[PDB]
Amino acid sequence: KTVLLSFLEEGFVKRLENAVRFGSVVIIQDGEFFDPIISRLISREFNHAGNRVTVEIGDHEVDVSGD
Amino acid sequence: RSISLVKSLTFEKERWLNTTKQFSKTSQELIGNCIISSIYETYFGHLNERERGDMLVILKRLLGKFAVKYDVNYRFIDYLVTLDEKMKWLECGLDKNDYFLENMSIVMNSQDAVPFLLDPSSHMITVISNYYGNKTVLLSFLEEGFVKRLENAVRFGSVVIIQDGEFFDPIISRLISREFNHAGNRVTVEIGDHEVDVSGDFKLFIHSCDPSGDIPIFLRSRVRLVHFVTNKESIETRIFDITLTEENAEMQRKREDLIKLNTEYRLKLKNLEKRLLEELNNSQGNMLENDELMVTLNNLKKEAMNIEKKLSESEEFFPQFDNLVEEYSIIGKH
Amino acid sequence: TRLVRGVYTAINTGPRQTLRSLIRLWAYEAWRIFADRLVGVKEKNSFEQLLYETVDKYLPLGNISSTSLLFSGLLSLDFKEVNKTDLVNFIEERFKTFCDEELEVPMVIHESMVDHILRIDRALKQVQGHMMLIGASRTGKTILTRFVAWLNGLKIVQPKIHRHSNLSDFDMILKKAISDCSLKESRTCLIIDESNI
Amino acid sequence: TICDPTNNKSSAMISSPALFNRCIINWMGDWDTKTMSQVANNMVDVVPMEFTDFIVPEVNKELVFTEPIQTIRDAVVNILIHFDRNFYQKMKVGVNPRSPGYFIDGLRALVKLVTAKYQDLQENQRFVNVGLEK
Amino acid sequence: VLKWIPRNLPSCLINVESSVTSVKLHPNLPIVFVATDHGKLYAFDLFNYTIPLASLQSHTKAITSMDVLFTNYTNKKNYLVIVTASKDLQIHVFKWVSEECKFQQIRSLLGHEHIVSAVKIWQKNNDVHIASCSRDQTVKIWDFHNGWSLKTFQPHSQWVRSIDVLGDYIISGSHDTTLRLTHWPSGNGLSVGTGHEFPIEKVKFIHFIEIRFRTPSTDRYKNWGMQYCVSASRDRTIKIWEIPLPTLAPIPSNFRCVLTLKGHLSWVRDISIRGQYLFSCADDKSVRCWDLNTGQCLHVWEKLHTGFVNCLDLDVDFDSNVTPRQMMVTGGLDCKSNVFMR
Amino acid sequence: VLKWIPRNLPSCLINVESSVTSVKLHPNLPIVFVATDHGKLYAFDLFNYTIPLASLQSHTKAITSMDVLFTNYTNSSKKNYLVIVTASKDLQIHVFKWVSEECKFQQIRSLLGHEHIVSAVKIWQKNNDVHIASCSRDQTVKIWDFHNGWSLKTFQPHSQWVRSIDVLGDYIISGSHDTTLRLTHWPSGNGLSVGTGHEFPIEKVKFIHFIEDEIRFRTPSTDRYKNWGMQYCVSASRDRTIKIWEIPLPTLAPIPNPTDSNFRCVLTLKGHLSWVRDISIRGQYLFSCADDKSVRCWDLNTGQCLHVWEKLHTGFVNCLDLDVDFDSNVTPRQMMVTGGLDCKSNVFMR
Ligand SMILES: Nc1ncnc2c1ncn2[C@@H]1O[C@H](COP(=O)(O)OP(=O)(O)O)[C@@H](O)[C@H]1O
């Protein structure tokens, strides 16, 4: 359940969204090319929407599984 | 310990021996009793007492011709109806008449067919509502908003009674025939103009208070029509109850209390005997080896003695009520 | 003129014929044309006796009773006699599939249903074939019709006629069915029950 | 589909030449004795009925709608068919089509009831035996 | 395939509520049927064997024996018939419906006046028969389809403990030390024999197969169809007998012991022959295998049960409709059924 | 090797407890996997078949389809293993490992997400990626990731519910309860073309894979089709008919072609007496079976029957399996397995 992404490849956003939604352990390679599009994960600024916890990434809101 | 317990249980030994000796007759008469009961449920819903007697004579003649034994002392109520059902039904407001009790058991044991109840007095609406207590919906074929409320009742599983059944609307046909789509892990029914989930706890009753009405063929051939109408003995019982409550209320209260308490005592004693036999069955060893079982059976026998003593003592007063009842048979007859 | 056309169709889509099989086919079509309308048992017996007498008079064969002539196109490619056991087994399997896919009905299979299903199939393989089923309630009319229509790939249309409705709704339903039959090439079996009049 | 051919609307539907001269009239009628016999033989096939002694009853051929009676099931089927016929005859439903609804429902109810009561019989006998042995 | 001996340890252990009184192996599927001493019958799948596939309370007293036959109709679908005889003086006949994992009762056979001790079922053409014997000393034959008796006879003064069926003949082993061959469709006794010291627990035909005791030594026995049988009793001894040839009902003439097998410490409870080997068990908590050609014990399963072993099951090797699978089953007092696979 | 036709009789008869819903041959070992109507999966040895090698009650309703794949990870330092995928009427798909050293079904995981019975499931492997696709009575086609165990793609190709899917490269061709096939590009989920011409619901549809050899319908006709990777497909229906279709070529995600959006039926096969239940192509031969107790061997060059196994089963024939002759990782063995309604399967060998 370990996913290897990169800031230097295409399809990054969707695969990270799925990993967030299902709770996999993600490693993003080539960290020197950090993309601020995932800023809300680094700062962990989540919306505690009642019984759920969500994060705004890319252009929409994605459920955080918590694992 | 062992000798005392076996001496106490000798009564149950005798009863058990008699039961197993009667096993042969009991097995011989089973098929005939089942035939009689099934026919009685299927055909006798809309017949009067005389017609039921005639049909039972005919059926017994057929059983005789084709060499099928049956209980010559067969009674529908005694064969199918138990104490718990009787007590609960009477508590719900059912009349004490045998005819009403038979109709109640037939309509309550309609597991597959939608029951159609004919009650000119609408008594059975009250009885059913008391039986289910709550979550009971009263619709009508003669009012607006019927379809939506029935849809919701289906979806959530309430017990629905539709009044004025003579105005049956075929828009609910798929419920009467119970033609459901078993959609994988769900069961749905097409009603009105769309598909509605069946919760599975939903139950439907149709009621009419217009005798000699008009039930169309489609509904008539697919429902278990049961008549709930008064007879001689119901009228006489009600007349006597009015006479007694007007003349002498204390005997009324004593009579009702004695009857109720004796019936409860009988139920308790029956269940206690059942518990005794079950406990002796699952001993996991010899009775001497299991001291807890010995103590349990002794305690059960003590409870049985207490219950039977209470019933026997309470019964001693009833002939007074028998004479008091005989006092007013003139009013009954007239 | 119906009998003529029937015989034609049976010969045209059938296997190689023998005189015996040809005559048996003629008797089968005679049953379908003339005898299906008879009500009592005595009339059916008289018709069977009449078939025997006519054959002896003009066509001098085995048993040609109503249940001895089971011609079908369900079990094969041509239209020919079939074994009772094979047809019963095939109908049972297809009926289980029909229950699974369309509607669960725990109905028992017997010989009369097989005769009736065969004649309904015969009727629904005709050009402009229409039939009117008369018999007691809960004898399997509607469900058997639906099953046959499912076997032949027809869309089943049952008008939702109910209380507080009138000729406007019935006209709309008929118009929709007509439009679908014509413009969408939708093969349709339209079931009209007497309670809907 | 017509259920009551004697009703006014059904009589109009049948006698009207617009429908009469085009449709194939298929007289379903009602179930005969052979169909009832076959249906009953299917229904009671799974009921554990053969658990007692049975003596072949001496009856006339006109009273038997099945093969010659050998088993209890044959007698039960014949009894049920005879009772349905007598019910319709004595209730005097005229010449109406004999709906088989009652027969079917009675068959299902009999299957269920016999199953349940035979189970109760066997369990009670087993418990009595165990008690006496103990 | 036949030259196969089970390993020392069972592949599968099955626990039941109480003592196992009889076990039979489903003739075509990996299913084992277990009849216990409380009147119940279980069906277990050998690959899912913890919770039974089916659990039936059929009788009210202990089951004493059972037999299984898979029908071979020449026209009508085939199915498995299970016949269960108990101390209730009743023989219940069931159909196994693999599609619902249930025991569908077909009927019951009545008529014996005491505990039924053995049953046997066989088929001729499309006719199926059920034979049995009980403590009332009577041996009775029922027609499966009809549901009532066909024939009755009494072969012994003492009551018959076990029977076997081949062709149209039955050897019945008595509660006495004697055994008797009778002609099935007439009741005419044909041969008698003794040699045991105590009541006979088992007796069965030895069928000819393509071995010392499984081929006819003369054309007379080839025409008759059988020459040898085997029995065992409470004298701890297994005895293999030659069957005398009658006046070819046949008219009578004693059984001749041709080989005696010993080794058990207690009563012999089961006999089963697979190819070249005789498998048996005793009331000494052991199973054992003798060679049928030389009459020596080849292998011993000690302490297979903590109680006594009541029954064995091995496949028939003398029937074209039976696959001789390499699987053997044992069951005994201690509420255990041991299944040896491969 | 590819010229082999089975003998007129089975090499062995394998008995099971109830109706056989599907069969699959183990791609390397002489083992056959059989799934039945009660939710049970079985593994049998083909030389000692009298006792099952193993069995497992995984689902609770009938298994509707089974597919199997033997992995081939590219030097990923992982042990390769047979993955057995089954789908049932329980609205579930179960994914198992075959543990050959123990001869058992080891469950890997389960996939959820359908609202009705699953009518087909397929598994295929790319460079170092394994995918599981399914279609079900809810009218949707869903593709899950094998390793991750959750849905990758969803799309709805038909207005009626989908009965059979086959996958080739990045395309899915789906037959439905409707009479029309549809070809869709699965990565983007954009429908490309439809094939009309059947009268009754579709039972099977399969791509026709090119063979490096010449065969009438297993070779491209143009450079465009050769480069595309597909020229023809085959489908079978309940109208007693098997049709060989010529696939239209979209503009190369692929763009639907405004003027070539329809399939062209190039050949029709008739001769079965009932519903056609399975089809399989080996070499130049098309093997199929029907609900008429029979199997047929067709010559793909002329569209005729070459051989017929009549009364092979006492009931309907439900499933066929042959090996893959268009994959370098699969040996085209002289093996066939048929399984059917009569609680039997027949295995033809050598
Ligand atoms: N052959 C049969 N076996 C068992 N039940 C039947 C049979 N035919 C009809 N029924 C009963 O009748 C009903 C189905 O017939 P249906 O088509 O509804 O008749 P109709 O709609 O013409 O009144 C069901 O309730 C079914 O139980």
Author numbering:
A (entry chain D): 3425 to 3491
B (entry chain A): 3291 to 3624
C (entry chain A): 2623 to 2682, 2686 to 2822
D (entry chain A): 2890 to 3023
E (entry chain B): 139 to 213, 216 to 350, 355 to 392, 397 to 400, 405 to 494
F (entry chain F): 139 to 351, 354 to 392, 397 to 494
Which sentences did the original study use to describe this structure?
Cytoplasmic dynein-1 (dynein) is the main minus-end-directed microtubule motor responsible for transporting vesicles, protein complexes, RNAs, organelles, and viruses along microtubules. Dynein is autoinhibited and undergoes conformational changes to form an active complex that consists of one or two dynein dimers, the dynactin complex, and activating adapter(s). Dynein function in vivo also requires Lis1, which is an essential positive regulator of dynein, as shown by genetic studies in many organisms. Lis1 is required for active dynein complexes to form, but how it enables this is unclear.
Using this subset of particles, we solved a structure of two dynein motor domains in complex with two Lis1 dimers to 4.1 Å. We called this structure ‘Chi’ because the dynein conformation resembles the Greek letter Chi, and because Chi follows Phi in the Greek alphabet. In our structure, two dynein motor domains, each bound by a Lis1 dimer, come together through dynein–Lis1 interactions which, to the best of our knowledge, have not been previously reported. This arrangement is consistent with previous studies that have reported the binding of two Lis1 dimers to dynein in solution. In Chi, the Lis1 proteins bound to the dynein motor domains act as wedges that keep the two dyneins apart, preventing most of the interactions that stabilize Phi. The one exception is a contact between dynein’s stalk helices, which acts as a hinge where Phi opens to accommodate Lis1 and transition to Chi. The dynein–dynein Phi contacts that are disrupted in Chi are replaced by new contacts between Lis1 bound to sitering on one dynein and the AAA5 and AAA6 domains of the opposite dynein. The AAA5 and AAA6 Chi-specific interactions involve residues on Lis1’s β-propeller that are different from those involved in all previously characterized Lis1–dynein and Lis1–Lis1 contacts. The Lis1 bound to sitestalk does not interact with the opposite dynein molecule in Chi. In contrast, in Chi, the linker is disengaged from AAA2 and AAA3 and shifted towards the opposing dynein molecule; this accommodates the increased distance between the motor domains caused by the presence of Lis1. The major features of the Chi structure—the disruption of most Phi-stabilizing interactions, a shift in the linker–linker interface, and the dependence of these on the presence of Lis1 and new interactions between Lis1 and dynein—suggest that Chi is an early intermediate in the activation of dynein that provides a mechanistic explanation for the role of Lis1 in this process.
